[PDB]
Design a protein around this motif. Structure first.
Motif, PDB file in Angstrom:
ATOM      1  N   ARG C  98       0.852  -1.195   0.000  1.00  0.00           N
ATOM      2  CA  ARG C  98       0.000   0.000   0.000  1.00  0.00           C
ATOM      3  C   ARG C  98       0.870   1.222   0.000  1.00  0.00           C
ATOM      4  O   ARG C  98       0.525   2.250  -0.594  1.00  0.00           O
ATOM      5  CB  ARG C  98      -0.832   0.157   1.242  1.00  0.00           C
ATOM      6  N   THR C  99       2.073   0.999   0.637  1.00  0.00           N
ATOM      7  CA  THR C  99       3.120   2.021   0.597  1.00  0.00           C
ATOM      8  C   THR C  99       4.385   1.230   0.579  1.00  0.00           C
ATOM      9  O   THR C  99       5.364   1.528   1.260  1.00  0.00           O
ATOM     10  CB  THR C  99       3.139   3.034   1.774  1.00  0.00           C
ATOM     11  N   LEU C 100       4.447   0.179  -0.281  1.00  0.00           N
ATOM     12  CA  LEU C 100       5.640  -0.583  -0.607  1.00  0.00           C
ATOM     13  C   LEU C 100       6.212   0.037  -1.835  1.00  0.00           C
ATOM     14  O   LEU C 100       5.551   0.013  -2.817  1.00  0.00           O
ATOM     15  CB  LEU C 100       5.337  -2.022  -0.950  1.00  0.00           C
ATOM     16  N   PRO C 101       7.477   0.503  -1.692  1.00  0.00           N
ATOM     17  CA  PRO C 101       8.323   0.928  -2.818  1.00  0.00           C
ATOM     18  C   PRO C 101       8.192   0.240  -4.194  1.00  0.00           C
ATOM     19  O   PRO C 101       8.402  -1.060  -4.243  1.00  0.00           O
ATOM     20  CB  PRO C 101       9.717   0.936  -2.332  1.00  0.00           C
ATOM     21  N   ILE C 102       8.017   1.089  -5.251  1.00  0.00           N
ATOM     22  CA  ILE C 102       8.023   0.735  -6.659  1.00  0.00           C
ATOM     23  C   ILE C 102       9.308   1.411  -7.238  1.00  0.00           C
ATOM     24  O   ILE C 102       9.647   2.568  -7.047  1.00  0.00           O
ATOM     25  CB  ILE C 102       6.832   1.311  -7.273  1.00  0.00           C
ATOM     26  N   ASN C 103      10.155   0.508  -7.870  1.00  0.00           N
ATOM     27  CA  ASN C 103      11.471   0.833  -8.401  1.00  0.00           C
ATOM     28  C   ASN C 103      12.343   1.279  -7.284  1.00  0.00           C
ATOM     29  O   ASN C 103      13.201   2.104  -7.439  1.00  0.00           O
ATOM     30  CB  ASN C 103      11.387   1.860  -9.601  1.00  0.00           C
ATOM     31  N   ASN C 104      12.135   0.607  -6.107  1.00  0.00           N
ATOM     32  CA  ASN C 104      12.854   0.707  -4.870  1.00  0.00           C
ATOM     33  C   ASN C 104      12.914   2.200  -4.445  1.00  0.00           C
ATOM     34  O   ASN C 104      13.984   2.715  -4.063  1.00  0.00           O
ATOM     35  CB  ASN C 104      14.265   0.162  -4.796  1.00  0.00           C
ATOM     36  N   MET C 105      11.760   2.855  -4.550  1.00  0.00           N
ATOM     37  CA  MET C 105      11.614   4.232  -4.166  1.00  0.00           C
ATOM     38  C   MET C 105      10.297   4.256  -3.442  1.00  0.00           C
ATOM     39  O   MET C 105       9.317   3.814  -4.052  1.00  0.00           O
ATOM     40  CB  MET C 105      11.452   5.184  -5.411  1.00  0.00           C
ATOM     41  N   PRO C 106      10.155   4.851  -2.254  1.00  0.00           N
ATOM     42  CA  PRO C 106       8.886   4.989  -1.512  1.00  0.00           C
ATOM     43  C   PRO C 106       7.682   5.421  -2.471  1.00  0.00           C
ATOM     44  O   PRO C 106       7.995   6.169  -3.456  1.00  0.00           O
ATOM     45  CB  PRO C 106       9.283   5.933  -0.307  1.00  0.00           C
ATOM     46  N   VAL C 107       6.429   4.912  -2.309  1.00  0.00           N
ATOM     47  CA  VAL C 107       5.261   5.190  -3.176  1.00  0.00           C
ATOM     48  C   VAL C 107       4.962   6.698  -3.210  1.00  0.00           C
ATOM     49  O   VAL C 107       4.734   7.137  -4.301  1.00  0.00           O
ATOM     50  CB  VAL C 107       3.994   4.385  -2.847  1.00  0.00           C
ATOM     51  N   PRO C 108       4.837   7.623  -2.197  1.00  0.00           N
ATOM     52  CA  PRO C 108       4.464   9.064  -2.489  1.00  0.00           C
ATOM     53  C   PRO C 108       5.600   9.682  -3.321  1.00  0.00           C
ATOM     54  O   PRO C 108       5.294  10.511  -4.171  1.00  0.00           O
ATOM     55  CB  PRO C 108       4.401   9.733  -1.108  1.00  0.00           C
ATOM     56  N   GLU C 109       6.878   9.345  -3.070  1.00  0.00           N
ATOM     57  CA  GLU C 109       8.058   9.781  -3.838  1.00  0.00           C
ATOM     58  C   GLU C 109       8.049   9.306  -5.311  1.00  0.00           C
ATOM     59  O   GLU C 109       8.505  10.062  -6.195  1.00  0.00           O
ATOM     60  CB  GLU C 109       9.426   9.277  -3.282  1.00  0.00           C
ATOM     61  N   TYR C 110       7.566   8.068  -5.599  1.00  0.00           N
ATOM     62  CA  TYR C 110       7.441   7.391  -6.884  1.00  0.00           C
ATOM     63  C   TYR C 110       6.521   8.142  -7.745  1.00  0.00           C
ATOM     64  O   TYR C 110       6.831   8.375  -8.927  1.00  0.00           O
ATOM     65  CB  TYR C 110       7.059   5.929  -6.760  1.00  0.00           C
ATOM     66  N   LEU C 111       5.349   8.616  -7.181  1.00  0.00           N
ATOM     67  CA  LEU C 111       4.397   9.444  -7.851  1.00  0.00           C
ATOM     68  C   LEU C 111       4.981  10.883  -8.202  1.00  0.00           C
ATOM     69  O   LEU C 111       4.582  11.512  -9.183  1.00  0.00           O
ATOM     70  CB  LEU C 111       3.087   9.585  -7.058  1.00  0.00           C
ATOM     71  N   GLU C 112       5.936  11.377  -7.415  1.00  0.00           N
ATOM     72  CA  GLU C 112       6.585  12.643  -7.455  1.00  0.00           C
ATOM     73  C   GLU C 112       7.571  12.647  -8.583  1.00  0.00           C
ATOM     74  O   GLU C 112       7.932  13.713  -9.108  1.00  0.00           O
ATOM     75  CB  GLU C 112       7.209  13.023  -6.079  1.00  0.00           C
ATOM     76  N   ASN C 113       8.096  11.461  -8.963  1.00  0.00           N
ATOM     77  CA  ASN C 113       8.992  11.259 -10.059  1.00  0.00           C
ATOM     78  C   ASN C 113       8.277  10.739 -11.265  1.00  0.00           C
ATOM     79  O   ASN C 113       8.909  10.582 -12.305  1.00  0.00           O
ATOM     80  CB  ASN C 113      10.165  10.360  -9.711  1.00  0.00           C
ATOM     81  N   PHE C 114       6.941  10.521 -11.159  1.00  0.00           N
ATOM     82  CA  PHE C 114       5.995  10.104 -12.145  1.00  0.00           C
ATOM     83  C   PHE C 114       5.533  11.360 -12.846  1.00  0.00           C
ATOM     84  O   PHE C 114       4.990  12.266 -12.197  1.00  0.00           O
ATOM     85  CB  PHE C 114       4.746   9.363 -11.563  1.00  0.00           C
ATOM     86  N   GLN C 115       5.858  11.465 -14.152  1.00  0.00           N
ATOM     87  CA  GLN C 115       5.656  12.581 -15.055  1.00  0.00           C
ATOM     88  C   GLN C 115       5.253  12.070 -16.370  1.00  0.00           C
ATOM     89  O   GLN C 115       5.267  12.807 -17.390  1.00  0.00           O
ATOM     90  CB  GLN C 115       6.896  13.502 -15.249  1.00  0.00           C
ATOM     91  N   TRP C 116       4.995  10.757 -16.449  1.00  0.00           N
ATOM     92  CA  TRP C 116       4.761   9.937 -17.627  1.00  0.00           C
ATOM     93  C   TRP C 116       6.087   9.291 -17.797  1.00  0.00           C
ATOM     94  O   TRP C 116       7.081   9.940 -18.198  1.00  0.00           O
ATOM     95  CB  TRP C 116       4.238  10.638 -18.915  1.00  0.00           C
ATOM     96  N   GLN C 117       6.092   8.015 -17.378  1.00  0.00           N
ATOM     97  CA  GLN C 117       7.231   7.085 -17.293  1.00  0.00           C
ATOM     98  C   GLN C 117       7.295   6.391 -18.557  1.00  0.00           C
ATOM     99  O   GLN C 117       6.298   6.299 -19.213  1.00  0.00           O
ATOM    100  CB  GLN C 117       7.056   6.103 -16.116  1.00  0.00           C
ATOM    101  N   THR C 118       8.535   5.858 -18.920  1.00  0.00           N
ATOM    102  CA  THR C 118       8.696   5.172 -20.191  1.00  0.00           C
ATOM    103  C   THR C 118       9.150   3.764 -19.866  1.00  0.00           C
ATOM    104  O   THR C 118      10.107   3.631 -19.072  1.00  0.00           O
ATOM    105  CB  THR C 118       9.798   5.877 -21.011  1.00  0.00           C
ATOM    106  N   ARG C 119       8.476   2.805 -20.453  1.00  0.00           N
ATOM    107  CA  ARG C 119       8.838   1.371 -20.335  1.00  0.00           C
ATOM    108  C   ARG C 119       8.701   0.877 -21.732  1.00  0.00           C
ATOM    109  O   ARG C 119       9.548   0.021 -22.177  1.00  0.00           O
ATOM    110  CB  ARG C 119       7.787   0.619 -19.487  1.00  0.00           C
ATOM    111  N   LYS C 120       7.610   1.361 -22.369  1.00  0.00           N
ATOM    112  CA  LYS C 120       7.352   0.962 -23.739  1.00  0.00           C
ATOM    113  C   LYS C 120       6.443   2.000 -24.261  1.00  0.00           C
ATOM    114  O   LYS C 120       5.911   1.859 -25.334  1.00  0.00           O
ATOM    115  CB  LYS C 120       6.733  -0.466 -23.761  1.00  0.00           C
ATOM    116  N   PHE C 121       6.214   3.057 -23.442  1.00  0.00           N
ATOM    117  CA  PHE C 121       5.145   4.011 -23.702  1.00  0.00           C
ATOM    118  C   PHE C 121       5.749   5.363 -23.917  1.00  0.00           C
ATOM    119  O   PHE C 121       6.558   5.712 -23.048  1.00  0.00           O
ATOM    120  CB  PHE C 121       4.059   4.104 -22.697  1.00  0.00           C
TER     121      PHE C 121
END
Lengths: 197, 343, 392, 52
Positions: C98-121
Motif C-alpha cells: 500500500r506504501t511498498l516501494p516501486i522501483n525501490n523508491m517509496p510510493v508518495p516519492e514514486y508518484l513525485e517522479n511520475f511525469q509519464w514514465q517510459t517502459r514501452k510508452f
C-alpha cells in the motif's frame, strides 16, 4: 408475572398462617365464624347472579364455536346453514335452564326480620342458593362449551357428507344431557330451602 | 379446541371445505379414461375446479397450462385463507411461504450466473414465495453483496447464519449449498415456532409433518451428494436439518455416507423409512408417505395444521392432474395410474 | 476517523484548470493552496503533470473516455488479485503493498517522479493504442499469476496424497516405505501377499485366528510391517485361490483388508510420485513469489498511467481550454481523508456548476447502506470536479 | 438509555451524522433520571423540617 403473584400470595398465606399458629392465636383464622356472620343475602344473590351469568357465558361460548365453523363450512355447502342451527339451539337451551332456575331461586328471596336474620334456616337458604346457583351456572357453562365443540365438528362433517349429521347429532344429545342434569341437581339442592324469614 | 374458533373459526371451515374438493380415487379413474386434453378439461369442470381453463378454448391448451392454472387457483385460495388470518395464524401462514421464498432466491440467482434474461427467469418463480426485492437479486453475483444489499430486509435474513462467503462469487455448486443451508435454518426456525406458539393438537401433528420434510430433505441431500458432489462430511453435516425423526443417530451415518450402501444401511436402522431405498420410485415413496401423513392430519379437528395438510394435498392433486394430462397428451398410458390418492 | 482504518498513505488525484481559484481561500493559487492550506498544512503534494499526446478528434475524445474508465477498473482488478496472493502466502509482508516501494523508491516519492514514465510508452504514440496496449500487458501479467497459483494448488493436492501413502492411515495408504523381501514374496507361482489393516485392540485376535481363517496360509507370516496410530498393518502370505476367502472372512471379524500385492514397478512408482509432487510444489512457490513482485511493479506503472491519462482526458472533455491542465496528486496522511475530501469539494466544486453540486457528504465503509460514495458513474450522485480517490 | 444507545450505536457506524442525534436523545433520556433526583432531593430536604 402471574406465576410470581401466585407464588407471592401463597407465601403470604403460609407466613400469615404460621405466624398466627405459632403465637397461639391460630383459631383467629376462623372460616366458620366468617360463614356464620356474613349476610345470607350475599350468598343468595351471588348464587342467582352467577347462575344466570355462567349459564350465558357457556351458551354464548358454544354459540360462537358452532357458529363460526358453521359459517365457514357453509361457504362451499350452503345447504347446512338452516338445518344445522339445531347445534346453536342445543347450546342455547343451557341459558334458558339457568334463567328458569335463577327466577325460581329469586322467588325465595324476601326480607328477613333482623331478630331472626342469622338463624338456622336463613343461613341454610343462603348457602343452598349459593351452591345451587354455582352448580347450575358451571354445569351449563361446561355443557354449552361441550355442545359447541361437538356442534362445530358436526357443522363440518355435515358439509362433508349429508348422512353424517344424523350420526354426529347423537354426540350433541349426549353432550346436552349435562345441562339438564345440572338443572335437576340445582332444583334438588334448593328444594327444601325456605324463603328468608 | 376451546379457544380455537375465536380467530380460526371461519379459516378452518373454509379449508375443510377446500378439503372436500380433493379428488377421490373414482374422480382420478374418471380422469384416466380421457382421450384428449379437452376431455380432461371437461371432466375437471364437474369437480371443484369448474371453469378454471375457460379462457383457453381448446387451441392453446397444453399440459403445462393446466399445471399453471390449477396451481394458480391453489395459490389464490391460499392467499384468500391468508388474508383472513391474524396473530399467530398469519405468522404460521408466512412461515409456510418462507420455504418457497428460499426456492425463488435459489432459482433467481442461478438465472444470473447463466446470464438468462430477468423477465423469463421470474415467470418460473413460485408465486407464494414472493417478496418485494425478489427481482433485485439480479444485481450482484457474490453472496455478500446479495445479502447486505437485498436480503437483509427480507424475512430470510436470520437464515444466513452459517453461509460462509469466502469471496468466491458463485458457481452452480455453492448455490445449492446456500439453498440447502437456508432450508436447514428455516426448518429449524419453523420447528421451534411450531413447538413454541402453535397450540397442542396442531403441535404434535405438525412436528411430524415438518420432521418429515426434514427427513426427506436429509435423504435427498445425502443421496444427491454421491453423483454431483465431492464434499467432506464435516461440511456436509451443516446441510442436514436437526429437527426430524432421523437426526441424532442416522444423519451422522448419512454425513459419512460415501456410497449408496452408506445411505441404505443408514436408513435400514430407522423404522418407517426402511424399504424406501430397496424397490420402486423413491420420489413416489416420499410423496405417498407425505399424503399418508397429511391424511391423518385432517382427522384432528381443531388444528391449524389442516392448512399445511390441505395445501400439500392440493399440490399433490395438481401434480397428479399434471401427470395424467402429461400421459393423455403424449399418448403414453403405461403408467397413467401412477398417481397418489389417499382421499 | 474510526469508520475506516488507514495506516498507509492514501492518494486523491485532482486535475483542475490552470486558471482556477479556490473559494475556500480566495486570494490563493491552487498550487500554493495544496501545500499551505490543505489539511492543516500537512498535505504532501506531488507532481503528476503529463503533456499532450495526439488526439484523433473531439469525436474521438468521447470514445477514449469511455475506454479509460473501463481499462482503469480492469487493471485495478488485476493489481488487487496480485497483492491478495502475495499477502495470502505470508512469505512477504502483509503490512505493505500500500506504501511498498516501486522501483525501490517509496510510493508518495514514486508518484513525485511520475511525469509519464517510459517502459514501452512514449508521448508520440496515439492515445487509442496506449489504452489498448496497457490493458493487454496488465491482462497478460495477471493471467500468468493465476496460472502459476492454479498449478501451486494442484501440487498441494498431490503432496498431501503422496504423504498419506508414506505414513497416514489405512484406508488408502499404499506401501513403499517397507521394501523388504522377508515381509513380501515375489517371483512366486503359488504364493501372494495380502495386507490386513487391523484395529489395535483386535491385534491379538488376528494373531490367533489368521491361519485357520482362510485355508492354505503361510504360518509365521505375521509381522508388523507398519503401524499408524489407529491401525496395525500385517503381511500374510497365502494361496492365490484362497485370497478371496481371507478378505471376505476377515471383514466379518472387523478387520479391514488393504488390497496390495508385491510388485517392484508399483513400489518404485509410488516413491517417484511423492518425489515429483514435492519438487513441483517447491519450484512453483519460489516462482510464484518472484513473479508476483515483478508483475506488481509493472502493473503499478501501467495503472497510474491510465489514471494520469484519464484525469487529463476528462479535463480536456469537460473544461476544453486551457490545453494543458494542472494535475497534482496529493498524498494524504492516514485518517485525514474525510477532511481532505470535504475541503476540495467546497473550494473547487463551483467551477463544475451548481447543477453538478449535491450534498451526500460522508463515507460508509460498512454494508448497511450504499449511499455516500461518490463516482460519476452512478446517477445517485456525482463528483463536482474531476477528482478520483485512490485507495491502495 | 439502553434502548436508545443500542439503536444509536448500531446505526451511527453507518451514518456518522447520527451521533449528534443520539447524544440529543440520550440527554432527554438522562433528564428523566435527573427529574427523579430533583424530586428525591426536595423530599429529603423536608424529611426533618418540623418534626416532633
Amino acid at each position: 408475572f402471574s406465576h410470581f403473584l401466585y407464588y407471592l400470595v401463597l407465601i403470604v398465606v403460609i407466613v400469615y398462617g404460621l405466624y398466627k399458629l405459632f403465637t397461639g392465636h391460630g383459631s383467629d383464622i376462623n372460616f366458620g365464624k366468617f360463614l356464620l356472620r356474613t349476610s345470607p343475602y350475599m350468598w343468595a344473590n351471588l348464587g342467582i347472579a352467577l347462575c344466570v351469568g355462567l349459564s350465558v357465558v357457556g351458551a354464548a361460548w358454544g354459540i360462537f364455536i358452532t357458529g363460526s365453523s358453521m359459517i365457514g363450512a357453509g361457504v362451499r355447502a350452503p345447504r347446512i346453514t338452516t338445518k344445522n342451527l339445531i347445534s346453536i339451539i342445543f347450546c342455547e337451551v343451557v341459558a334458558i335452564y339457568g334463567l328458569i332456575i335463577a327466577i325460581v331461586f329469586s322467588s325465595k328471596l324476601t326480607v328477613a326480620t333482623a331478630e331472626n336474620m342469622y338463624s338456622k334456616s336463613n343461613l341454610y337458604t343462603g348457602y343452598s342458593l349459593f351452591w345451587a346457583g354455582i352448580t347450575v351456572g358451571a354445569s351449563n357453562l361446561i355443557c354449552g362449551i361441550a355442545v359447541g365443540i361437538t356442534g362445530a365438528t358436526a357443522a363440518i362433517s355435515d358439509a362433508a357428507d349429508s348422512a353424517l349429521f344424523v350420526k354426529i347429532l347423537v354426540i350433541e344429545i349426549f353432550g346436552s344431557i349435562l345441562g339438564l342434569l345440572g338443572l335437576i341437581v340445582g332444583l334438588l339442592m334448593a328444594g327444601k330451602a325456605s324463603e328468608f324469614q | 379446541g376451546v379457544y380455537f374458533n375465536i380467530d380460526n373459526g371461519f379459516i378452518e371451515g373454509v379449508v375443510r371445505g377446500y378439503r372436500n374438493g380433493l379428488l377421490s380415487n373414482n374422480q382420478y379413474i374418471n380422469l384416466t379414461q380421457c382421450d384428449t386434453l379437452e376431455d380432461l378439461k371437461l371432466q375437471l369442470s364437474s369437480t371443484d375446479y369448474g371453469n378454471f381453463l375457460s379462457s383457453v378454448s381448446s387451441e392453446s391448451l397444453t399440459t403445462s397450462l393446466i399445471q399453471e392454472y390449477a396451481s394458480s387457483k391453489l395459490y389464490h385460495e391460499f392467499n384468500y385463507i391468508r388474508d383472513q388470518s391474524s396473530g399467530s395464524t398469519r405468522k404460521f401462514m408466512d412461515y409456510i411461504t418462507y420455504g418457497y421464498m428460499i426456492d425463488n432466491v435459489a432459482l433467481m440467482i442461478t438465472g444470473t450466473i447463466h446470464d438468462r434474461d430477468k423477465g423469463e427467469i421470474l415467470q418460473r418463480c413460485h408465486p407464494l414465495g414472493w417478496f418485494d426485492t425478489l427481482p433485485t437479486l439480479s444485481v450482484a453475483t457474490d453472496l455478500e453483496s446479495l445479502y447486505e444489499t437485498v436480503l437483509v430486509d427480507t424475512p430470510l435474513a436470520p437464515y444466513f447464519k452459517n453461509c460462509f462467503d469466502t469471496a468466491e462469487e458463485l458457481d452452480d455448486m455453492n448455490i445449492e449449498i446456500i439453498r440447502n443451508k437456508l432450508y436447514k435454518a428455516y426448518l429449524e426456525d419453523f420447528y421451534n415456532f411450531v413447538t413454541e406458539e402453535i397450540p397442542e393438537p396442531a403441535k404434535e401433528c405438525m412436528q411430524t409433518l415438518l420432521g418429515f420434510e426434514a427427513d426427506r430433505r436429509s435423504i435427498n441431500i445425502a443421496l444427491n451428494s454421491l453423483q454431483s458432489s465431492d464434499i467432506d462430511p464435516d461440511l456436509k453435516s451443516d446441510l442436514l436439518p436437526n429437527i426430524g425423526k432421523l437426526y441424532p443417530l442416522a444423519t451422522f451415518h448419512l454425513a459419512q455416507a460415501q456410497d449408496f450402501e452408506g445411505v441404505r444401511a443408514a436408513l435400514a436402522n430407522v423404522y418407517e423409512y426402511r424399504g424406501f431405498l430397496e424397490t420402486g420410485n423413491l420420489e413416489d415413496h416420499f410423496y405417498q408417505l407425505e399424503m399418508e401423513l397429511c391424511r391423518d392430519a385432517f382427522t384432528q379437528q381443531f388444528a391449524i395444521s389442516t392448512v399445511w395438510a390441505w395445501m400439500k394435498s392440493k399440490e399433490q392433486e395438481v401434480r397428479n392432474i399434471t401427470w395424467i394430462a402429461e400421459c393423455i397428451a403424449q399418448n403414453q398410458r403405461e403408467r397413467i395410474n401412477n398417481y397418489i390418492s389417499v382421499y | 476517523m474510526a469508520t475506516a482504518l488507514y495506516t498507509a498513505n492514501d492518494f486523491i488525484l485532482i486535475s483542475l484548470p490552470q486558471n482556477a481559484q479556490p473559494v475556500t481561500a480566495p486570494g490563493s493559487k491552487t498550487d500554493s493552496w495544496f501545500n499551505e492550506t490543505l489539511i492543516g498544512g500537512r498535505a504532501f503534494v506531488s507532481d503528476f503533470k503529463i503533456p499532450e499526446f495526439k488526439i484523433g478528434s473531439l469525436d474521438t475524445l468521447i470514445v477514449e473516455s469511455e475506454e479509460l474508465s473501463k481499462v482503469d477498473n480492469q487493471i485495478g482488478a488485476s493489481i488487487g488479485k496480485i497483492i491478495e496472493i502475495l499477502q495470502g502466502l505470508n512469505e512477504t509482508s502483509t503490512n505493505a503493498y500500500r506504501t511498498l516501494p516501486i522501483n525501490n523508491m517509496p510510493v508518495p516519492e514514486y508518484l513525485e517522479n511520475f511525469q509519464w514514465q517510459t517502459r514501452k510508452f512514449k508521448l508520440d504514440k496515439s492515445i487509442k493504442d496506449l489504452i489498448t496496449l496497457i490493458s493487454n500487458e496488465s491482462s497478460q501479467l495477471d493471467a500468468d499469476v493465476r496460472a502459476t497459483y492454479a498449478n501451486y494448488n494442484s501440487a498441494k493436492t498431490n503432496l498431501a496424497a503422496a504423504e498419506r501413502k508414506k505414513t497416514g492411515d489405512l484406508s488408502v495408504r499404499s506401501l513403499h516405505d517397507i521394501v523388504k523381501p522377508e515381509d513380501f514374496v515375489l517371483n512366486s507361482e503359488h504364493l501372494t501377499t495380502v495386507l490386513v489393516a487391523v484395529p489395535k485392540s483386535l491385534k491379538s485376535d488376528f494373531e490367533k485366528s489368521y491361519e485357520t481363517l482362510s485355508k492354505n496360509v503361510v504360518p509365521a507370516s505375521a509381522s508388523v510391517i507398519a503401524e499408524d496410530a489407529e491401525y496395525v498393518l500385517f503381511n500374510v502370505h497365502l494361496f492365490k485361490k484362497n485370497v478371496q476367502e481371507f478378505t471376505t472372512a476377515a471383514r466379518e471379524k472387523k478387520f479391514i483388508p488393504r488390497e496390495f500385492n508385491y510388485s517392484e514397478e508399483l513400489i518404485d512408482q509410488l516413491k517417484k510420485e511423492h518425489d515429483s509432487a514435492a519438487s513441483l510444489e517447491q519450484s512453483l512457490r519460489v516462482q510464484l513469489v518472484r513473479l508476483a513482485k515483478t508483475a506488481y511493479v509493472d502493473v503499478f506503472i501501467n495503472w497510474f498511467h491510465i489514471k494520469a491519462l484519464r484525469v487529463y482526458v476528462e479535463s480536456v472533455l469537460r473544461y476544453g481550454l486551457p490545453p494543458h491542465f494542472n494535475i497534482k496528486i496529493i498524498a494524504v496522511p492516514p485518517k485525514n481523508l474525510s477532511k481532505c475530501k470535504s475541503e476540495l469539494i467546497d473550494a473547487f466544486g463551483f467551477l463544475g456548476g451548481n447543477a453538478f453540486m449535491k450534498d451526500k457528504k460522508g463515507k460508509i465503509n460498512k454494508q448497511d447502506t450504499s449511499l455516500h460514495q461518490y463516482a460519476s458513474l452512478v446517477d445517485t450522485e456525482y463528483e463536482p470536479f474531476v477528482m478520483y480517490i485512490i485507495n491502495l | 438509555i439502553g434502548i436508545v444507545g443500542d439503536a444509536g450505536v448500531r446505526g451511527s457506524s453507518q451514518q456518522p451524522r447520527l451521533f449528534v442525534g443520539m447524544i440529543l436523545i440520550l440527554i432527554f433520556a438522562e433528564v428523566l433520571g435527573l427529574y427523579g433526583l430533583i424530586v428525591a432531593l426536595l423530599l429529603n430536604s423536608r424529611a426533618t423540617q418540623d418534626v416532633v
